Amino acid sequence: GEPVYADAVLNGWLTSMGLGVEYVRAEGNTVYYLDDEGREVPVLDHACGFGSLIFGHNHPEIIAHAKAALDAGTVVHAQLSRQPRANQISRILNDIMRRETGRDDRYNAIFANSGAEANEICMKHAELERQERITALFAEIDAELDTAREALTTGTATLDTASLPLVDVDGVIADIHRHNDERRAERPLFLTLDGSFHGKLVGSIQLTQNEPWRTPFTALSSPARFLPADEPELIGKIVEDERRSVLTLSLDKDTVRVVERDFPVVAAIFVEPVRGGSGMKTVTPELAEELHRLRDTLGCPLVVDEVQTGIGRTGAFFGSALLGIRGDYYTLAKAIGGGIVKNSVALIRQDRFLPAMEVIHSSTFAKDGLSASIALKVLEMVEADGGRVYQRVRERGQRLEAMLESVRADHSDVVSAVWGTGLMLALELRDQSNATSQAIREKAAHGFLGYVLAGFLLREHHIRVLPAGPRSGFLRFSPSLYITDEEIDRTETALRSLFTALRDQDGDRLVL
Amino acid sequence: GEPVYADAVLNGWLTSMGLGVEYVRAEGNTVYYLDDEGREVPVLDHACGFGSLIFGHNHPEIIAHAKAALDAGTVVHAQLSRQPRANQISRILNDIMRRETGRDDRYNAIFANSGAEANEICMKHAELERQERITALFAEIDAELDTAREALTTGTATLDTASLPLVDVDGVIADIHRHNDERRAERPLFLTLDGSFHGKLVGSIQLTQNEPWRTPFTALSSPARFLPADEPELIGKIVEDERRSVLTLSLDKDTVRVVERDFPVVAAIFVEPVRGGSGMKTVTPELAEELHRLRDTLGCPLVVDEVQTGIGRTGAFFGSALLGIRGDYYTLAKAIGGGIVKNSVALIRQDRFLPAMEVIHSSTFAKDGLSASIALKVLEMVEADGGRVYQRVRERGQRLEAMLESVRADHSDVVSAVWGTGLMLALELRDQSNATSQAIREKAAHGFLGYVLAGFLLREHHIRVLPAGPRSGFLRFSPSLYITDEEIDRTETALRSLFTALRDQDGDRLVL
Ligand SMILES: Cc1ncc(COP(=O)(O)O)c(/C=N/[C@@H](CCC(=O)O)C(=O)O)c1O
Ligand SMILES: Cc1ncc(COP(=O)(O)O)c(/C=N/[C@@H](CCC(=O)O)C(=O)O)c1O
């Protein structure tokens, strides 16, 4: 019971899962902890900052560049001055997007400090677009009301009273204006997929499915409707239920009617090309086409969240390009910081970009000179040698996926599936809530199975894995492109060992 | 008409203000741009990352520490593992808070990536506290309804029908549950001061007064009520109008009555000890005591935003400690990154801290090992030599404030006031909307006066100043504690020159 100032509950919980270790040094695909006698134990890292480390921990080329930037007296804090590196970074991302999609679309860049901040720039810009559509619609309704009033107060037309259930000339117009103003102040909706993960700030948390992470915060901010990814059939009806109307007066020269017209409620659709919070499921072509339909139908942007799938993880720079997802806005973060600094970017198609956003949105630390320099280095590295790095991710991914499939095939009793693409892979664990072993069953029931299995992998095979998915029902594999054949073989051995113990329901070996 | 990929509108606007320059290098209180012939021109920086650079640009001690951390193979990405530096940082902040306030309160630390993200951790934890208060209140109401039902369906008591205007035993209870459920799902309120700046993300932007930055985003997220700082008289009534009731049945053995009870609407009160968005006005004792009364009365936390006032800027570590503001939660960011990295912290009093927050809140980049190491270095630097660094800030502050007051006294026709404390100072500019010069008048009317005057100071005196406040009506002075007497004299000369031109209404010299 000594004084503790952070992390007591987090550390207590990690210790009971068998993950209570302090990593003291890291290089490439290895993190080191200290044993009882103070010796470094190498651990293979398959978590890698939840896919931040495409080039591994502390890549010598990123470390050298960071030290050169610091020694050159880089201007980190140059707010409200010319920072051409921001334009230079956006130009490269623009060229890469054009090459990978064959589309000649141009994107404005706004920078931020995290994946959530980049997603929230997109939520804000989407709401600027919706307020533009609202202004246009309300201006038209004013004109339609003036024309209907001209016709009713001067002979021409008679107000049909069959339509009054939707609400005397002047009083009907007051009732319409009251109805419309209420509608206009209502919060918008966001559309996301089931299992969506888009961050955990006040805005972004509402876009994140995981119920214990989100539901306490429901009242703070605009909600999302979580569309069922597996059944595109059902999305149509869910979105149709969210339809809302404003009222106007329609003149048919003879008769004036109160009529409903459509109100823009949906600010944006968000999609991850490979769904982190769903256990690394790739968006199917059928779901891609439903998101395209929704975007074309509602006139709101489709925001492609590549915070995790970007910077080569899937075997292309953009996962969306690989899977044929045609977004209006794109977000990047994780790997762009080179595994050492914090940086993110929102790319917004220039034909939709509202110039006000460049001067009403800002952040102290955004576009800092240090992370700008490191971004340019990361982009040079991932693009080097005519795109060989993408090729390496693809062949390392194939080797790791083949190993995971080979393991699943011999352990189908405890492993249901392999998901993901390139170096963003996961094993789906079969439910263990009815497990013979009480200790395993108890942990599975509390949603901790993945964490317990991760602990086994650490203490018995010196491999760092973290679970994914809503009840730690998936094991994530997202190492660097430098993962060796030998490290893949040691992972295979570790998994056969883990899944043999799980088949045998050896609770004393698995749960501490 | 060439392709541009970032910052076209930002750069166009900075050029027209006379602030179109690229800083290529920075050291201490100097940023350098390149002249036509490629020579470095020294500019004195009074903006310093909006008060991020208490130790100046690229302090050798922070640069050396950052390079040592990178060369040691510091684990930047160690998510869901033991990271003791987080507890070590919180321990130091805890010890400093105790020393400066004489209170023996303990604080839990949650880390993030920006000042806004730290403020949003506080908004989220404040909403967890409100959901706890709501659960308790609704549990009591259930018990009160059961006891009232027992008494009405068995002789004891008669339902008084004088109270029914607030809504048959079973039907009155259904109407109460419907009323209460509607109330429970309503968005909360935040309380802030007029001129408040708390960040610009989906949640935090609602807490920021500046109307063009906020009003486009009104529909997204819980609003703030902006309390008038200068007239505490009026705060009582504004908060009293926001009172909301839930219903219950109160048994007085004899009679059962429908009665209103208080519902917790206000999630949190936010305050800056020195109000950045108000032109650096310090919170008065009278306003401090009104915020204390509101906090004690509503039972919500008082969140002290020290993103700008913290890490020694005001002549103490905590500005709140200096001005007697007794917060429940505190936020820090800017200077804690050493002017090179991105880091922030929310300190939440342990007697209020809800353990769920440690495991339902997270961020990829939060608590990274590199910014953790740099935080410890910054804390060691600001605390060194038994607090002499705070003494230095106070005597540099006095010297700079005295100079600004000396300038005001001879230029009261264009300068209305000096605001702030320690090294967080501003000049208030008198309104120039009636200026003789058309060019000046036009710029003042558009809210750009401060920016224009900043441009004069850059091109004619090689001094970087940025405006503050809602219509660039204040000039910010927030240099490093290394600001020399000579740099203060050059600033005095530059300001006499600027304010002499403004008195003379020399529009051709001031506006390009
Ligand atoms: C697809 C996607 N979108 C947004 C985010 C939020 O990025 P951050 O705010 O930098 O953590 C992320 C971060 N993802 C990690 C974050 C885990 C955590 O919150 O610590 C994960 O899924 O495990 C993301 O993956
Ligand atoms: C008192 C206070 N609270 C929160 C913030 C937001 O922190 P960040 O998200 O890191 O920009 C800040 C940032 N302040 C600067 C930054 C301006 C900007 O670039 O957005 C200012 O007042 O001008 C702050 O001062």
Residue numbers in the entry:
A (entry chain A), B (entry chain B): 6 to 172, 178 to 522
Quote the authors verbatim.
Previously, the biosynthetic pathway of the immunosuppressive agent caerulomycin A (CRM A) from the marine actinomycete Actinoalloteichus cyanogriseus WH1-2216-6 has been identified, and the critical role of the (S)-selective ω-transaminase CrmG in the biosynthesis of CRM A has been reported. CrmG catalyzes amino acceptor caerulomycin M (CRM M) transformation to caerulomycin N (CRM N). Moreover, the activity of CrmG is insensitive to inhibition from ketone α-ketoglutarate or pyruvate.
The crystal structures of CrmG in complex with amino donor l-Gln, l-Glu, or l-Ala in P1 space group were determined to resolution 2.35, 2.25, and 2.20 Å, respectively. For these three crystal structures, each asymmetric unit contains two dimers. In the structures of CrmG with l-Glu or l-Ala, clear electron density was observed between the N atoms of those amino donors and the C4′ atom of PLP, indicating that we have captured the external aldimine for these amino acids. In the structure of CrmG with PLP-Glu, γ-carboxylate of the l-Glu portion not only forms a hydrogen bond with S372′ but also forms an additional salt bridge with K210. Based on these three crystal structures, amino donors l-Glu, l-Gln, and l-Ala exhibit strong, moderate, and weak binding to CrmG, respectively, due to side chain differences. These corroborate well with our kinetic data that, Km value for l-Glu, l-Gln, and l-Ala toward CrmG is 80.02, 182.70, and 405.10 μM, respectively. Moreover, in the case of l-Glu, which forms stronger interactions with the active site of CrmG than l-Ala, the corresponding by-product α-ketoglutarate also exhibits very weak inhibitory potential with a Ki value of 145.9 mM. The energy profile for CrmG catalyzing l-Glu deamination was calculated based on the crystal structures of PLP-bound CrmG and l-Glu-bound CrmG; the energy profile for CrmG catalyzing CRM M amination was calculated based on structures of PMP-bound CrmG and CRM M-bound CrmG. CrmG catalyzing l-Glu deamination is an exothermic reaction with calculated reaction enthalpy of −33.5 kcal/mol, and CRM M amination is endothermic with calculated reaction enthalpy of 11.5 kcal/mol.
